[PDB]
Design a protein around this ligand. Sequence first.
Ligand SMILES: OC[C@H]1O[C@H](O[C@@H]2[C@H](O)[C@@H](O)O[C@H](CO)[C@H]2O)[C@@H](O)[C@@H](O)[C@@H]1O
Ligand SMILES: [Ca+2]
Ligand SMILES: [Ca+2]
Ligand SMILES: [Mn+2]
Ligand SMILES: [Mn+2]
Lengths: 240, 240
Amino acid sequence: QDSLSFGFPTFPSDQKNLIFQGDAQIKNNAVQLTKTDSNGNPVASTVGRILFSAQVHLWEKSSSRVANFQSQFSFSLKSPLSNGADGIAFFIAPPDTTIPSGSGGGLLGLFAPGTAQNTSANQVIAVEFDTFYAQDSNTWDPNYPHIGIDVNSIRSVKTVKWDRRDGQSLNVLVTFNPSTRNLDVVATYSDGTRYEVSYEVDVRSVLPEWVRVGFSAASGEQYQTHTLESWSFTSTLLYT
Amino acid sequence: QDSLSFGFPTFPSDQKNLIFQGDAQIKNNAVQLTKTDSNGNPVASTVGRILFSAQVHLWEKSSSRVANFQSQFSFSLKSPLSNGADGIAFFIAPPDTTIPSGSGGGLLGLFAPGTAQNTSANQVIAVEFDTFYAQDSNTWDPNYPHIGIDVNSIRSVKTVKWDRRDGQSLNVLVTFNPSTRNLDVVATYSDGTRYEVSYEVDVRSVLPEWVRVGFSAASGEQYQTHTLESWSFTSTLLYT
Ligand SMILES: OC[C@H]1O[C@H](O[C@@H]2[C@H](O)[C@@H](O)O[C@H](CO)[C@H]2O)[C@@H](O)[C@@H](O)[C@@H]1O
Ligand SMILES: [Ca+2]
Ligand SMILES: [Ca+2]
Ligand SMILES: [Mn+2]
Ligand SMILES: [Mn+2]
């Protein structure tokens, strides 16, 4: 289809169109990307992702068209630790994408250690909300929590300072306009605090015509819950 | 998802979210539900169906919600004969639906012979565009071409006299309103000729909570092409 849209105001346990990978599962009408114990507390060494089952037609060679898409979602992070890790990311990748071996912790379940910073070995666009930036282990990160745009590498093409707020939901709107090729990110907390970051990228040179969209999160030695609370997505092919 | 929508203005060969069953295949940017030869002419004894891959949440027992839905599509029928058969149908059924054994010809690839008129043995709602009504083989049909609403039986609960026009595209709008429980069908030819038929039905007592939507067509001894040209669908769970 040239156009596709779906909306999850909440996430009931009875799901049919979500692909669950790793430890991801539904609990209390939300998606818990990372594993939690019986008490609902976060644990270390966990990775989880979800993808919508239907494939999205991002661009089309034959017609020279590229999709205009928007993804709106909200999530919250919670941890008793002073340095909860590692973060959650909205991502777009080839349909057959699976969790790479050793992609835990700072690699957010998106990259393999051997090629995490090799842009020629990956096919992924992701918007990360990264809460762990220890310069000794996450050497590629700026020294502070941040929102980053990742294009084929865990080393973001761009980041902006972000404030992690325990237990508070962050609403995010990610849009891509094929005419300007701008990928825009706008995130806000309920008190009006806003973060904005944009990057110009030709998705046709990074991803295949058909892709899947979803979320990924991980926790290494430090941990926190990564709770996806709602998600709506729409995409339509436009001539450009 | 509480809401889902998709649109196929045309049907390029590169399809990823369609389930093809029987003889259905893409040719010339359209879906040919029934088999055709090299010259492109229709052949006898063929059945074909397509279903969208993502499951639709038609109703939710826990929240007591039922979805409204709208399906818009266009198709054309062509045949060297004047008695083209058998017809095409838009249908909604359980996700694991497959072509029943011996469902060719007048059964439109939707029902099994032994239970075609047994409402207690079926789970399907369909809107048929029936062009063949010979009483020797299609005993359940009115004696004229027609559009009908089928609820668990090949014998339509409601029909309207219809005119088959070789090679002309028929635009159809099918809508279900959970508030009134009315399934409405409006079909029009380009010159404005219009046909309408509606029926009140509680989808909750006929189908499971999750379903798949698609089209089916068949040709027995008499034949014609059943070309699906475009298709858009939208569904949203409502409280009412
Ligand atoms: O495709 C039309 C029709 O074909 C087959 O039935 C035949 C027709 O009723 C007509 O041609 O007369 C034949 C002789 O009695 C009869 O077989 C079946 O496949 C039927 O299901 C289909 O509708
Ligand atoms: Ca990090
Ligand atoms: Ca018939
Ligand atoms: Mn980072
Ligand atoms: Mn009929």
